[PDB]
């Protein structure tokens, strides 16, 4: 029975649980890697070794945090648990294919771990640009293991995308149109469309890199008439949609959390929220070369990419102001999940605004490949995507498990993490403006003070991560079982109790048309 | 007991064996490229084929033999197949982007021209044109097969499907001979790289699509399809039209325009 | 060929509690055991190969 | 375009079989003829060791490492030229 | 170069860098204003026991918070693109200098007249002369004439690098097989530092750039002595 | 939310044990590696 | 040569597919493929909600085009009202 | 006709950041001019402008590689 | 069927909180420890 249930699953909730456990374990790996980065940089000089060991750590840090922590948790974890319940469906469309999306991920992670154990690892950056990642400057198996890791993660997400799109289009109650589905469901659908379109282009590009490394092709090798910059276009054609993939399910969870702890039955401006997520998804495909403003691109192309990138602020601002308008007039419950979501609104906005600074290609000449970029994306990832993950985890843990957290401990955890991430990353704006490059294991002496503060901040976040583990332990150890949950009339996923039975909606909901 | 029309699937080992086959194929390719050994790769390829066989076997058991494919389930599979084909289109789009990037801006190493100095392209009016007529013809014959099936005509369904498959095989054999006869190779710079990787992935999909048509052929021989319910045939025909259209883009772009 | 779908329908709808991947009979169990043995043994072998490749070999 | 043909009323198997045998397979037969007329080897050109061709950044994982997968001795020179 | 506890950009050495500073000041003011407004409104929404939980009509207010951000973006884009095209304008250089990236050092070529070229490596920390800067000095600096328009051409002979001098507002990727152009004009004599700005392997952190800007006559005599 | 009292209450002393064990499980192995870094590098 | 030999659904559909096909022919919807059409929803004319057990979840789209659906369990017994719009629903178990 | 050459002037054929083709074209032009002159008897001095421009713009290693391949018979451009 | 309810819809036991503490310790601790030991591994090669 144990093997049947947990290795042979065809159940959306158990598979969601598998993803949450996998993503939590990956989050520990990614945290350890982040602490090694900041230990190397926490005082001037060399701690670990030269830039190769340092940038194997940096590279693995990014792949682990993105592919094995955020996407499995948001899409595989919250998506599998919540989407079928939020539309009253009895499972996913392809419940057995769903299980393969999960089980491709431990092999993908093993391949990444293998990459770092063989030879001198893949010290390439998570962008894996040639020729540094090619077979002369990264001879041996490490980069190929990284490519294959991405291949498996990519198949996992593409099949998952097919599953979510099909489920959300085809398995709603017959009276429920797409404009009666909750915003988290919308956010997962749009994320899945971005995954479906973008990951095959990544797969093409990394396969070309694999054949340049092993079959003597020369897609990216000028000696054969290839071009390293072609790789960058294919990568970033995926890589910008990817950061919208990383935030969109977060936007969906934030809409639900803000609505719920404002005591509201609905988010402010529902159709504007749908419009904004679709607009962000669409604009996210036509801006990728803002990752390439220093490669030698014509001025008119730089002007286009500057302008197209900045436009995304308009739908994103509608979402931020709609969240604030959802709070407006609420009976505010100062739950730990609400604290995560309020921190999200503010800190995501800061990171979005530094992204708008970077969209200006003239300023980006000086800011590109410096810690100003690192500061931008850690405000939207460590204080955006992750704050939404923590908010959703604390909010829905009693649904998934049937047990409550200790809310005081969870508020303590939020407070520590909030101090930690801001101490880590706010000084990195100063380091970027003043010229500290990315992917450096050591820095000119002038940069010492902010690197020291930044590293101290990273240790505060470590303490928060350790406390999180204790808090989950304490909840399972004490076994306080949920009784009543308010606002079930507008939060269908709670209406089958905590935890819901293995099979829910065996009898579908009744929704009439009028 | 349920009162919706969707399919609760029995707990299944094939997702796990499929995922492990992916691990064995990729670690196997690594072992082959770097440690001079085909062992892991052959195991992975074997378990991959076993996984695909038993998984799609079970889908046939669930539908033809157990009746789980209600109209709602079939509609989901239709969306599933369309989305899968869309993802495959985007995969090929990356190789067409590589082709146009390199050929529209030929670098000095090439002679600054396309085709590169020293490259002698195949004549697009010889076997490439023949291959084009073959896949186009097979798109006509698979449409005849589809109409015969909907009209309840077992013999002409089988005849037309057999002709479609024969043409798929003909294309593959012609392409194999053209690969052997080609005076340029995959190592002949970006010309050979784009040519063989793009037409190579295309050829793999022709083989996949041909195999799928052959599966439909034997299920038809065993009377699995009704005149109204035959999604496996529809999916194989959509995939086959996708293979035909990718070929027409390759022909116009790489063989003709790029010659 | 004659149409024997009806007898397959009877076989795969028999009320015997078997999951669909084993419901054809003893050949299903054999093919399953072969598949899973190759997958698990191959996975162990891939781990051995990682162990080997993680160290220099002169 | 209406192409140049023209036969509906309620589409069907009979029309698509008509197209298969009356247009599609005859076109394949014509192209098969055209191709068999123009086959026959072409003179292999002088070998020139161009550096953008016969790329070898890593030995191939088969054979002696130096032969492409569908190596044809008649028309595919090695980096050092045509084989004996 | 950067100085300890620096918060903002290095002082401008070129007119284009001065334009960037003023444009950054303009944009940062807008960033601060919007960030603070959002923080303030959050606090406003959270500090009253008054409630209103029935359905709220969205149509009117969404005009405001679409139109106002569109106007703000235009107020950023206009000076942004002006600097972009001004950056791009024809200027007619007096001198062309190439730099080739390598693992892990830069080489320079001044071949308008004679065949002058040399390598430029970081000074190891153990060999710094007293008062020299760790990780920033090089053995052979890029001597250049001040107050003159210079064409820099940037490439690489191995992996990607990127040739950067923050106080001149310069960063141009070094790509093998490609020859990227940028222009450089220093308003002042002096020493202007930068660092390799594309990850390039084991010593990425340790292949810096040092420009030495002097009067033309000094540059000419230096050039002749480097042959 | 409302909830039942804990079925198996975790006293302050029990929480102190769970917290201390949790923190040591993260800190001790990494501390051992970092403490011995010189030993690894000088090898 | 227009011949036959392809089974029809009537001949060969089985299991749940066949149940759905046979019920649709009778104009019945035991597997909930169609949206039910609302009554006036008064206490006199409540929406009749079929169930194979003694409670079923109702979602109430109170007004046309509302994006918010109001969800609640409907139990066997006296008609209940949507908590937002008051329209009446009554369970009909079978 | 008369020098005072300082560096290669702006060339409207090559107005963008990537100057690879500017270097390549002036290299080709110089050697094409050279070949034409040396044959019909005349003076390579008429080719001098292209020589100065490609020398200004082209990385030494590119020139060196191209020269080696011309000597080898493997230069892929047309001269 | 399968077990339903709190503590039963998970692949790990929560019947004893101290056994659970050990299991969670091994689980999260092994993830956090792995990069330090991979770094050590790479340092002890070259
Ligand atoms: C926004 C994230 C939350 C805050 C996180 C930590 C909070 C720390 C304060 C931080 C509280 C916000 C104040 C920020 C400006 C402080 C530094 C400055 O004078 O910046 C100057 C510029 C460059 O300017 C110059 O070239 C002139 C230099 C003038 C020197 C004068 C001497 C100053 C004394 C030294 C100051 C030490 C800095 C402290 C170092 C701080 C270490 C942590 O640098 C920069 O652009 C940095 C670019 C940052 C872009 C992100 C903007 C986010 C704004 C959010 C604020 C909302 C409401 C505030 C209220 C926010 C309260 C939450
Ligand atoms: C969650 C992930 C995430 C998100 C959501 C974003 C969102 C944005 N990013 Fe970010 N970005 C990254 C993750 C993300 N980014 C990563 C990982 C990198 C680096 C990759 C690498 O090199 O490794 C990066 C790099 C990156 C660059 C390249 C910089 C360089 O390398 O030199 C740029 C440049 O334009 C950019 C811009 C933006 C913009 C304009 C947005 C916008 O979507 C933000 C829009 C939001 C707002 C503007 C705030 C809310 C709005 C209002 C309150 C309305 C009013 C506001 C105005 C009127 C301005 N990003
Ligand atoms: C989701 C993405 C993500 C996240 C969360 C983080 C988190 C952190 N990152 Fe990361 N980082 C990247 C993505 C991310 N990073 C990327 C893409 C790069 C560029 C790589 C490259 O240059 O190639 C990068 C680069 C980068 C650098 C630059 C290295 C360089 O240029 O040399 C630094 C340095 O300080 C850094 C530090 C940190 C720190 C201290 C954290 C800390 O905030 C981490 C703190 C801990 C957490 C945030 C908790 C994590 C765990 C969970 C959330 C699981 C929760 C469990 C349950 C819910 C059950 N990162
Ligand atoms: C014969 C008719 C066509 C049928 C298809 C034939 C092969 C298809 C196989 C897969 C094709 C996919 C791309 C593989 C890359 C190269 C294959 C290109 C097609 C091909 O077969 O190219 C051959 C080279 O094969 C080679 O190098 C090596 C060939 C074998 C090595 C395969 C390497 C592994 C590739 C892994 C790709 C991972 C993809 C994952 C995508 C997931 C998303 C060309 O032979 P040649 O001697 O160079 O020139 C002919 C000279 N007379
Ligand atoms: C470097 C080399 C790397 C190699 C990596 C290989 C990785 C994976 C190993 C793959 C093993 C595949 C085994 C067969 C999987 C068949 C899946 C399938 O057919 O899934 C179907 C759904 O997907 C659908 O239709 C439509 C979708 C069909 C997808 C078929 C499988 C595709 C796998 C590769 C996808 C790559 C996409 C690439 C685009 C770049 C059915 O879904 P189930 O939930 O099963 O059933 C539901 C029941 O109601 C059926 O009666
Ligand atoms: C709706 C339309 C939006 C704009 C899309 C335009 C796409 C194709 C533009 C092709 C422009 C070529 C014009 C011919 C002459 C100049 C070619 C050149 O030299 O440009 C080179 C770029 O080449 C290249 O292939 C570029 C290759 C194509 C990249 C397009 C990215 C889209 C990928 C997903 C689809 C440089
Ligand atoms: C080397 C590796 C690849 C090797 C070759 C694989 C060839 C593909 C064979 C697929 C066979 C699928 C058979 C099962 C099937 O066709 O199942 C049908 C459902 O469709 C379905 O799942 C449709 C599911 C099919 C999706 C297949 C798509 C191809 C996947 C190939 C992998 C892509 C790799 C790309 C690499 C770049 C069953 O429903 P019906 O037909 O309506 O029958 C019911 C009636 O009888 C009732 O009256
Ligand atoms: C899941 C992650 C997996 C990552 C995969 C990385 C690639 C793994 C392939 C490596 O396989 C090893 O290759 C060696 C070299 O071919 C073999 O030794 C062979 O060659 C040795 C060196 O000559 C000799 O000592 C031995 O006789 C002989 O067994 C060894 O047995 C084999 O296992
Ligand atoms: C970034 C994540 C890590 C953050 C910081 C970790 C905080 C460190 C926690 C303590 O770790 C222990 O520290 C001891 C020293 O205090 C080490 O003992 C070492 O030193 C002792 C004292 O000299 C000797 O008695 C021991 O034998 C010798 O192993 C011991 O191995 C190590 O487990
Ligand atoms: C251990 C906690 C989780 C581990 C995850 C994978 C880490 C594997 C580490 C490799 O171990 C070390 O390699 C060194 C050779 O350079 C030696 C040392 O003796 C060995 O042990
Ligand atoms: C970046 C990409 C080239 C990718 C490649 O080198 O492979 C090119 C191809 C087509 C280009 C676009 C088209 O030329 C149309 C537009 C032309 C404008 O002058 C700039 C924006 C503009 C929208 C271009 C931006 C960018 O240069 C594009 C998208
Ligand atoms: C055996 C079967 C008769 C129909 C039935 O079983 O009732 C017949 C009808 C259609 C026949 C097939 C089709 O006519 C197409 C093919 C024609 C080739 O000449 C022989 C194989 C070929 C594949 C035939 C084999 C076999 O004779 C088939 C399959
Ligand atoms: C069901 C189970 C799979 C367990 C798994 O999923 O972990 C069993 C059933 C038959 C077993 C296989 C073989 O029939 C027997 C092999 C020898 C031993 O008895 C066990 C390993 C052995 C190689 C088995 C692997 C695996 O444990 C199998 C496949
Ligand atoms: C028409 C459509 C859906 C309305 C509905 O059927 O409920 C609504 C939903 C979101 C609306 C958009 C968003 O509110 C954002 C913009 C707001 C501006 O006031 C008008 C244009 C604007 C772009 C709106 C146009 C239009 O009214 C949209 C697109
Ligand atoms: Cu050179 Cu980084
Ligand atoms: O990517 O921003
Ligand atoms: Cu981007
Ligand atoms: Mg860069
Ligand atoms: Na350091
Ligand atoms: Na059909
Ligand atoms: Zn109502």
Author numbering:
A (entry chain A): 1 to 514
B (entry chain C): 3 to 261
C (entry chain J): 1 to 58
D (entry chain G): 1 to 84
E (entry chain B): 1 to 227
F (entry chain M): 1 to 43
G (entry chain F): 1 to 94
H (entry chain H): 7 to 85
Please quote the paper that reports this structure.
The Fo-Fc map of the IO20 model has two peaks between Fea3 and CuB. Since these distances are too short for two nonbonding oxygen atoms, and too long for covalent bonds, we assigned these peaks to a mixed structure of a peroxide anion with an O-O distance of 1.55 Å and two nonbonding oxygen atoms (designated as OA and OB, existing near the Fea3 and CuB sites, respectively). The two oxygen atoms provide an identical occupancy, 0.40, for both monomers. The other form includes two nonbonding (nonperoxide) oxygen atoms (OA and OB) located 1.82 Å and 2.70 Å apart from Fea3 and CuB, respectively, as illustrated in Figure 8G. The Fea3-OA distance, 1.82 Å, is significantly longer than that of Fea34+ = O2−, 1.70 Å, in the P- and F-forms, suggesting a Fe3+-OH− structure. Thus the other form is assignable to the O-form. The OA-OB distance, 2.71 Å, in the other form suggests an ordinary hydrogen bond, in contrast to the low-barrier (short) hydrogen bond in the P- and F-forms, 2.54 Å (23). The CuB-OB distance of the O-form, 2.70 Å, is unusually long as compared with those of normal Cu2+-OH− coordination compounds, suggesting a very weak negative charge influence of OH− on the CuB. In effect, the water channel is closed in the O-form. The unusually long CuB2+-OH− distance in the O-form of 2.7 Å suggests that CuB2+ has a very high redox potential, possibly because it is under weak influence of the negative charge from the bound OH−.
